[PDB]
Amino acid sequence: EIPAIDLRLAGGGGGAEETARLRDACARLGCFRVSGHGVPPGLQAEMKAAVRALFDLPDDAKRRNADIIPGSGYVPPPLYEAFGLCDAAAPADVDAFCARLDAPPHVRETVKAYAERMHSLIVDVAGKVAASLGLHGASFQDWPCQFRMNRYNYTQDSVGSPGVQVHTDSGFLTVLQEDECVGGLEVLDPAAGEFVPVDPLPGSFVVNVGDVGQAWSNGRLHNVKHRVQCVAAVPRVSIAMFLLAPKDDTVSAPGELVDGEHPRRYREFKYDDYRRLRLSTGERAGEALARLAA
Amino acid sequence: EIPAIDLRLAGGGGGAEETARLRDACARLGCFRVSGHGVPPGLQAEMKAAVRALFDLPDDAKRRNADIIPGSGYVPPPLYEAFGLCDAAAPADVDAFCARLDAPPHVRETVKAYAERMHSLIVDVAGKVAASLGLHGASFQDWPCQFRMNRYNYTQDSVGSPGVQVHTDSGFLTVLQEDECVGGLEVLDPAAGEFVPVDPLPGSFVVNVGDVGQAWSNGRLHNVKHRVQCVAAVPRVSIAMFLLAPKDDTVSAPGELVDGEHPRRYREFKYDDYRRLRLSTGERAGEALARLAA
Ligand SMILES: O=C(O)Cc1c[nH]c2ccccc12
Ligand SMILES: O=C(O)Cc1c[nH]c2ccccc12
Ligand SMILES: O=C(O)CCC(=O)C(=O)O
Ligand SMILES: O=C(O)CCC(=O)C(=O)O
């Protein structure tokens, strides 16, 4: 159901069909799975263990991991706890975060390698998306990112309840690695108006388009609404890399995306201001973009 | 609380402590985890998918996989189905089994590589167990083996029910790869008097000592009673390699394990005959070994 895109295949000629499949998934659904991503299974297995080690830390160690670099670190709960790292595209922030974690050295080094590999992956995905719209020369390498590790502490009581309410991601694109054993990711299919489970598929990643994706693409890429249902009584652990917006914080569709049959949809805006707008309105499912129409 | 043994570490000098931990786990519990086993993570990931692909085959493809070599192939169900391969230590049998599976070539190749790698593992484990009892020169390379791929088709109605009843393995040693998501394996811990779960730990294997282990070791290695509770409403998939008995089928303890304080416990017997005896008495938890006292 959710399209699977092989990233090694996507490209030209023989890759042309897979690139068109990529664009179609971004346009119709805003969500797809990625294979061919090049992240080694050994590193994935080390990261799974390391993230569980981190969340299995005594509460007091977890709390020494709060605010270890400005704005980032451990975030306590309501069944939710997380480690967040901004700016995950900045090598000096990634280095200091991992050096500052109260954790065993082998854990800190695995997190560092994985955040670095996820950054390269989301930049590679963003580039292939941009090329499916005919855009070359775009570099996403220095766009700020937010790396997050989360755990949802499900119990028997929370089974059946949406373990995360419906929202869009504010930013451009998101790459997610879901718990293999507990999948709850559901995305609203904009063509039927129905939630579609994104069942876990080991060793692959999920990609979601966010609000900045919709705006930068001049409406061509769908900012996907999604939620997480609690589907078992077991803690769910997941990892996400959020590609946010350009380094200069300005969101503006590129020239070549304004047609004549698809006129320019949104005024130029600053990502940080948009984030404030979601905050003050409570509109966290893309509604606030309507207030930014051109 | 199941001891974990690092196989690269175990051996001499610097591994003398680990070897003694190995023997102690075998003698007191009959069960231990192995790390450092050298099965690469990529192969483990490919096998998890291949085994799930095999069990997801249509019913007609599964029936075409019954009896593909004499005595081996698919076995249908109540909630249990499986693919078994004897003799998994015999290259000719492994080759013909995988050549004859009705499945895509990449599945056949993955199963072949896995069966072969699991064979090398269980031989290496057997050798280290033998060395922990001061035994060298022993070669297990040609002992018959059974390779099994299992699926227990749990549902909401299965939860809280035994998945497999309490028994011992008849053979020497068993190496298991349990479903990372669905546990359920429990062993009767001698020190405790109650069954204790062997919760899955990704990328690690569980080793269990069987009845032939107890007899060959002259009583020094415990043949562990185990079962599997249904702990979740999703299918549980597992892989096991059973090291059975010597090629000449005779079970007889080596001289150096019978001393003034531990005299010879069991008469020599043919493994085949011992299997018959379990089948005809219904004694599947090691009770039938008492009929073989010296
Ligand atoms: O996009 C973000 O994660 C930051 C943010 C700012 N105001 C918000 C409202 C709802 C959801 C997220 C945000
Ligand atoms: O494992 C098998 O398929 C054969 C077997 C060996 N010992 C057994 C005890 C009870 C039932 C079957 C067996
Ligand atoms: O799906 C998850 O568990 C975390 C990522 C998420 O839900 C989000 O995009 O904010
Ligand atoms: O299929 C399994 O998970 C193992 C069942 C069992 O009791 C065994 O290993 O003999």
Author numbering:
A (entry chain A), B (entry chain B): 3 to 79, 84 to 300
Quote the study's own text.
We elucidated the crystal structure of OsDAO complexed with its substrate, IAA, at a 2.0-Å resolution. As expected, OsDAO had a stereotype structure of 2ODD, and formed a dimer containing two IAA molecules at the interface region. An IAA contacting subunit A (green stick) interacted with R154 and S176 of subunit A and R282 of subunit B via a water molecule, while the other IAA on subunit B (cyan stick) interacted with R281, R290, and S176 of subunit B and R282 of subunit A. These subunits directly interacted with each other through hydrogen bonds at residues D278, D279, R281, and R282. The elution profile of gel filtration showed that dimer formation of OsDAO occurred in the presence of IAA but not in its absence. Km for IAA of the dimer was nearly fivefold lower than that of the monomer, while consistently, Vmax of the dimer was 22-fold higher than that of the monomer. These observations demonstrated that the activity of an auxin-catabolizing enzyme, DAO, is regulated by the same mechanism that regulates GA2ox; namely, through substrate-mediated multimerization. Recent studies have revealed that DAO controls IAA concentration, which is important for modulating auxin homeostasis, since it is dependent on catabolizing IAA. Interestingly, all DAOs listed in Supplementary Fig. 10 share Arg or Lys at residue 308 in OsGA2ox3, which is essential for GA4-dependent oligomerization and hyperactivation, as previously mentioned.
Here, we determined an X-ray crystal structure and performed functional analyses of two rice 2ODD family enzymes, OsGA2ox3 and OsDAO, which catabolize plant growth hormones GA4 and IAA, respectively. Both enzymes formed tetramers for OsGA2ox3, and dimers for OsDAO with the aid of their substrates, thereby enhancing their activity, as schematically summarized in Fig. 5c. With increasing substrate concentration, the enzyme gradually forms a multimer with the aid of the substrate itself (effecter), thereby resulting in an increase in enzymatic activity and in the active catabolism of GA or IAA to maintain hormonal homeostasis. The results revealed that a monomer–multimer switching occurs based on a substrate level, and that the resulting conformational change enhances the activities of these enzymes to maintain phytohormone homeostasis, in full agreement with the allosteric theory by Monod and co-workers.
